[PDB]
Structures are given as structure tokens and as C-alpha cells.
Design an enzyme around this catalytic site. Structure first.
Site, PDB file in Angstrom:
ATOM      1  N   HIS B  73      11.273  58.605  89.780  1.00  0.00           N
ATOM      2  CA  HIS B  73      12.389  58.776  88.847  1.00  0.00           C
ATOM      3  C   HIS B  73      12.731  60.231  88.522  1.00  0.00           C
ATOM      4  O   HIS B  73      13.908  60.593  88.446  1.00  0.00           O
ATOM      5  CB  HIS B  73      12.122  57.990  87.562  1.00  0.00           C
ATOM      6  CG  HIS B  73      11.949  56.517  87.785  1.00  0.00           C
ATOM      7  ND1 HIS B  73      11.601  55.648  86.774  1.00  0.00           N
ATOM      8  CD2 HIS B  73      12.061  55.764  88.907  1.00  0.00           C
ATOM      9  CE1 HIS B  73      11.501  54.423  87.262  1.00  0.00           C
ATOM     10  NE2 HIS B  73      11.774  54.466  88.555  1.00  0.00           N
ATOM     11  N   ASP B 229      15.712  54.510  92.949  1.00  0.00           N
ATOM     12  CA  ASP B 229      14.372  54.735  93.499  1.00  0.00           C
ATOM     13  C   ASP B 229      14.420  55.356  94.892  1.00  0.00           C
ATOM     14  O   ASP B 229      13.672  56.285  95.196  1.00  0.00           O
ATOM     15  CB  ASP B 229      13.582  53.426  93.600  1.00  0.00           C
ATOM     16  CG  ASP B 229      12.947  53.017  92.287  1.00  0.00           C
ATOM     17  OD1 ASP B 229      12.718  53.892  91.430  1.00  0.00           O
ATOM     18  OD2 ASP B 229      12.662  51.812  92.123  1.00  0.00           O
ATOM     19  N   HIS B 252       9.369  51.184  98.044  1.00  0.00           N
ATOM     20  CA  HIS B 252       8.779  52.503  98.257  1.00  0.00           C
ATOM     21  C   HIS B 252       8.079  52.681  99.607  1.00  0.00           C
ATOM     22  O   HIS B 252       8.216  53.727 100.241  1.00  0.00           O
ATOM     23  CB  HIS B 252       7.815  52.836  97.113  1.00  0.00           C
ATOM     24  CG  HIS B 252       8.496  53.025  95.791  1.00  0.00           C
ATOM     25  ND1 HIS B 252       9.493  53.957  95.597  1.00  0.00           N
ATOM     26  CD2 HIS B 252       8.327  52.403  94.600  1.00  0.00           C
ATOM     27  CE1 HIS B 252       9.909  53.900  94.344  1.00  0.00           C
ATOM     28  NE2 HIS B 252       9.217  52.965  93.717  1.00  0.00           N
TER      29      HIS B 252
HETATM   30  C1  LIG Z   1       7.981  52.259  88.555  1.00  0.00           C
HETATM   31 AS1  LIG Z   1       9.179  51.663  89.867  1.00  0.00          AS
HETATM   32  C2  LIG Z   1       8.657  49.941  90.600  1.00  0.00           C
HETATM   33  O1  LIG Z   1      10.591  51.451  89.080  1.00  0.00           O
HETATM   34  O2  LIG Z   1       9.443  52.834  90.993  1.00  0.00           O
HETATM   35 ZN   LIG Z   2      12.012  52.853  89.721  1.00  0.00          ZN
END
Ligand SMILES: C[As](C)(=O)[O-]
Ligand SMILES: [Zn+2]
Ligand SMILES: CCCCCC/C=C/CCCCCCCC(=O)O
Ligand SMILES: CCCCCC/C=C/CCCCCCCC(=O)O
Ligand SMILES: C[As](C)(=O)[O-]
Ligand SMILES: [Cl-]
Ligand SMILES: [Cl-]
Ligand SMILES: [Cl-]
Ligand SMILES: [Zn+2]
Ligand SMILES: [Zn+2]
Ligand SMILES: [Zn+2]
Ligand SMILES: [Zn+2]
EC number: 3.5.1.108
Lengths: 266, 266
Positions: B73, B229, B252
Site C-alpha cells: 500500500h 495492490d 501478490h
Molecule cells: C494486506 As493486502 C491482502 O490488502 O495486500
Molecule cells: Zn491491499
């Protein structure tokens, strides 16, 4: 038993489960014949059924424009230990929920009991009584000792279970925590409650799951907690109670209804 | 555009969503050519893909025995505002989650930008590339501007939704928050994560409900957040990115896989 108070001032603080606000408690010793009462902004509010103002998701008391939410846990602990004379000064709008059980209250108060010079004037259930409400039911009958049984009928994995408290087993219910079902959360939030609820003070259950990583303290923790809640509401009778109670799916509303009916008859 | 840094140090603090521990960040200005790097316990950790050590439920970086969780973030916000030279000192083991979005970061940094004397050398996607993994897919291709599309396929009321970000629409994604499904919570807790998660920093959804009393900020908040993200993970390439991206059910792990493939080729 002899009336009791605390040997010295005891203090507790923390968030309130419904208001989500921070509050503090100061338990003041009091002499014989005082009874249990709260104190807030210059007003004394007796821990008696005549001062109940709300019973949805908690038992709240009020008098002369001053209100205090969620008195059931501190009152249950006081009842269990037979503390009959104390002033619970509240700096805030609700009793701190702490971990959702009466453990912290119980441990601190238990090692500070001060016996006084008067025999307790118990509220003794004299004749059988039954109160009902949409399937829910609570029965009270004569007994030399306080016996409380709660039977739940949950719509999740808990199914149907019951638990019986008898004098001497106080430790079996003081650790049991407040609980809620995931399908009830939106409603509670919508009605302006549960603002301070978290997995740290509430056991949240689903149809088939347990969200708290620590899981349940007992397979029947919920019914043990319901018993704990009922014993707190029973103290609204004004003094330690002697009677045998059976509650089927009861809650604060039905508990208070039973209390008022008991008070009326005797 | 010109490389940029902050006019003065900026601080942020709160709880880490996964560790549940208090943490703080202090963003310090740096001269041209420095790049983005984190600092923890005497070690500098470059915000680059070679330092990624974990990608399950967050993008974590590490170097010489020092690790920092959840950099996605803060990096996304930096990427969006093209901040290119700063040192982010970290107190704790994870970046504070705040409200789950990049809003606080965005608003603070946006008002404290300092243009520098050097043109930005963007990472330009030169040729189409595709990475896949169990139905998930991400495609990257040439473009003079950063364009990011995320298409999700959820097992709840959300169904199939899509959202496209294009340069200039930064405000459309910096408010979108982290989200989780109620049926995933036990798993997340079980793997030692989500210890700081709450309705204040996480949008919790059920098969048919939204637990947060405030509800969703946008009917497609989840996909907007996924775009957010991905943009944070893309910055692990070492510099602002110019390219058109399409992600179908990406996360991710796949985002980092793509970054590493892009880095290899170019
Ligand atoms: C903490 As996340 C799953 O929003 O990158
Ligand atoms: Zn996130
Ligand atoms: C599930 C995790 C997190 C945050 C807590 C959710 C809010 C729960 C509301 C507080 C519980 C209040 C008690 C009501 C239960 C009852 O009347 O049976
Ligand atoms: C029943 C309601 C709620 C209890 C709230 C607990 C918070 C959830 C854990 C933190 C979420 C972290 C994000 C990871 C999710 C993912 O990668 O899919
Ligand atoms: C529902 As409760 C606050 O009495 O445990
Ligand atoms: Cl209600
Ligand atoms: Cl209700
Ligand atoms: Cl996973
Ligand atoms: Zn006696
Ligand atoms: Zn209600
Ligand atoms: Zn209770
Ligand atoms: Zn996982």
C-alpha cells in the site's frame, strides 16, 4: 452468610462493548445496609429492577437522567461473591467489558472481601413461578441454595445443550465469555450497539465455525455464560438470591420479566 | 516527469494488519538517483523485487536478517505520485495498515511533493508478456501510460466484476480498502497472520453480506483495491512503470511473478 464489602477501593477500566467508548470503574466500600448501587455524575442508581431501562443485548440501568449500560457481568460477580454493600462509581456510559467474562472482576474482588456485622437478608423464592415469551421460558422455585440451569437451543453446531450452576462452583462460570453469531452482527451494529466488540471480548460463532483463534474455553461456554448473565440479572432483586432456576432460551428481557414478577409476588 | 521526493519527513503509525503489533513509518527525503528504500535496525532494504521474501496475504521484503511485512500500500501510493527518492525508516516489523487503503498516505504525501533536477527513467514494458497460475492470469503490454485492469471472479454476491485504472484517476483507487471473506478468516489466523485485522482496517464479506456497518465505499471496492495492490507490487521493478496490464484473479504471488519475468526480459 454475613454481609460483605471490599477492603479497599478497586478500579477497572477499558472499552465498553456496546458504546465502544472508554470507561472507568471505582468500587467503593460501604457500610452495612447500604446495598449495591452505582454512582454517576452525582446520582446514585440502585442495582434494582425498578431502575432497568433497557434489556436488548445488555441490561441497562438509569435514574434522574443518568444511564449506565451493561451492568450484568459486574453484578453477577458481586452476587456470586455475596458482596452486598458497595458503590460502583462509573466514569463513562457503560461498564468495561474487559475480556467478555467476569474473571478480572472476580479475581480482584475475591481477594478483597471484607465480612461485616450483619446476616445477609436473602431474597428467598417462596412459590414456583413461570414466565414465557415466544418459546422462551424461565421457571423459579424454592431452594435453600442458589441453583441456576440454562438450556440453549442454538441454530448452529452448538445445537441443544445445558449447564447447571450450584453454590461452590462459581469458578465454572466466571471465565465464560460474551458470545455472538455472525449472522447477528449487522443487526447489532444497525441498532447502534456492539461498537466496542472484537474477538478480544466476544466469542463469535458461525453456523459451523469459531472465528476466535483461541476457540472456545469450554464446549458449552455459551450456556455457561448465559447462566452467568442470569445470575447478574437476578441480583436486581435487591439482595443475594436463594432459589432454583431453569431457563430455556432465556435472555435479559425474560430475565428481568421474571425478576419483576418475583418482586411483585413477594 | 521529474524525479520527486518529499518536502519534509512524514510520519504514520498504527497497527500492522498481520502482526497485530504497533508500528511506525518515517519517510525521509533523499537526493536524485537514490530511489525508494526501507530502513530497519541498521539495514537498508531496497523496494525491489530481488528482496521479496513472502507473498502470501501481503508482499514482504527482507535483507540481511531484517524483514518488513506489507509494503504494497505505501509503495502503491508512492508509485502513483511518482515519488522516486526516499528512505522509509520502519519501527516494527510491518507497515501500519491504517484504514486498509492508501488514503492517509496519499493525502499527506500529495501535499508535500518536491520536484527534483532529473528526468525520471521509467520502466517501459517493451513486449507483451503473460504469466499464469491455476486459472489466474496477468498480461502486460506496451503503453505510453500506466493502465491497470483487474477482473475478479468471487464466490459471493460480488460475482464477476472489473475495474480499469488509467493515469489521472488516482483518487478512484486510493480509498479502496483491504478485504477478506468470512470463510477465510480461520485460515489466515491459523497461518499466524491477520492478527491486527478488524472492521476498521478490513472489509469483511460473507457469502451474501457485508459485516462493516459503513458497508462498501464502491460496489466494486474489492477490484479497485486489487488494482491498488498490483500497482504497489509493480513498483518493485525499481521505477515508475509505463504499460498496460490486465489481471484476472491475480494476487501478490502472481504479481511478483510477473515483475520478475518483466525484469528478466528487459
Ligand atoms: C494486506 As493486502 C491482502 O490488502 O495486500
Ligand atoms: Zn491491499
Ligand atoms: C467477528 C469479529 C469482530 C468484531 C465484533 C463484532 C461485533 C459483535 C457485537 C458485540 C456483541 C454484543 C452482544 C450481543 C449478543 C447477544 O445478544 O446474544
Ligand atoms: C466475521 C468477521 C470478522 C473478523 C475480522 C478479522 C480480520 C480478517 C483478517 C485480516 C485480513 C488480512 C487480509 C488477507 C486476506 C487475503 O489475502 O485474501
Ligand atoms: C449479551 As452480554 C453484553 O450480556 O454478554
Ligand atoms: Cl435490539
Ligand atoms: Cl435483537
Ligand atoms: Cl492462501
Ligand atoms: Zn449467615
Ligand atoms: Zn437487537
Ligand atoms: Zn454476558
Ligand atoms: Zn494463506
Amino acid at each position: 452468610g454475613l454481609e460483605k464489602t471490599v477492603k479497599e477501593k478497586l478500579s477497572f477500566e477499558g472499552v465498553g462493548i456496546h458504546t465502544g467508548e472508554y470507561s472507568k470503574l471505582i468500587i467503593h466500600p460501604e457500610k452495612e445496609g447500604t446495598g449495591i448501587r452505582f454512582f454517576k455524575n452525582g446520582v446514585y442508581i440502585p442495582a434494582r429492577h425498578e431502575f432497568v431501562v433497557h434489556t436488548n443485548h445488555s441490561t441497562d440501568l438509569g435514574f434522574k437522567g443518568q444511564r449506565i449500560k451493561t451492568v450484568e457481568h459486574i453484578l453477577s460477580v458481586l452476587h456470586l461473591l455475596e458482596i452486598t454493600n458497595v458503590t460502583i462509581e462509573v466514569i463513562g456510559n457503560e461498564i468495561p467489558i474487559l475480556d467478555g467474562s467476569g474473571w478480572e472482576f472476580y479475581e480482584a474482588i475475591r481477594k478483597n472481601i471484607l465480612n461485616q456485622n450483619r446476616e445477609i437478608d436473602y431474597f428467598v423464592v417462596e412459590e414456583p413461578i413461570i414466565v414465557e415469551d415466544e418459546g422462551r421460558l424461565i421457571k423459579a422455585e424454592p431452594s435453600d441454595t442458589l441453583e441456576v440451569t440454562y438450556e440453549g437451543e442454538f441454530k448452529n453446531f452448538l445445537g441443544r445443550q445445558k449447564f447447571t450452576f450450584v453454590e461452590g462452583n462459581e469458578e465454572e462460570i466466571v471465565l465464560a465469555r460474551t458470545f455472538a453469531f455472525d449472522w447477528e452482527i449487522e443487526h447489532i451494529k444497525k441498532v447502534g450497539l456492539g461498537k466496542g466488540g472484537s474477538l478480544k471480548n466476544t466469542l463469535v460463532l458461525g453456523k459451523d465455525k469459531v472465528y476466535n483463534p483461541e476457540g472456545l474455553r469450554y464446549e458449552n461456554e455459551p450456556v455457561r455464560h448465559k447462566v452467568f448473565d442470569l445470575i447478574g440479572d437476578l441480583y436486581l432483586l435487591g439482595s443475594p438470591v436463594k432459589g432454583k432456576f431453569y431457563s430455556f432460551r432465556g435472555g435479559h428481557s425474560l430475565n428481568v420479566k421474571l425478576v419483576k414478577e418475583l418482586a411483585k409476588k413477594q
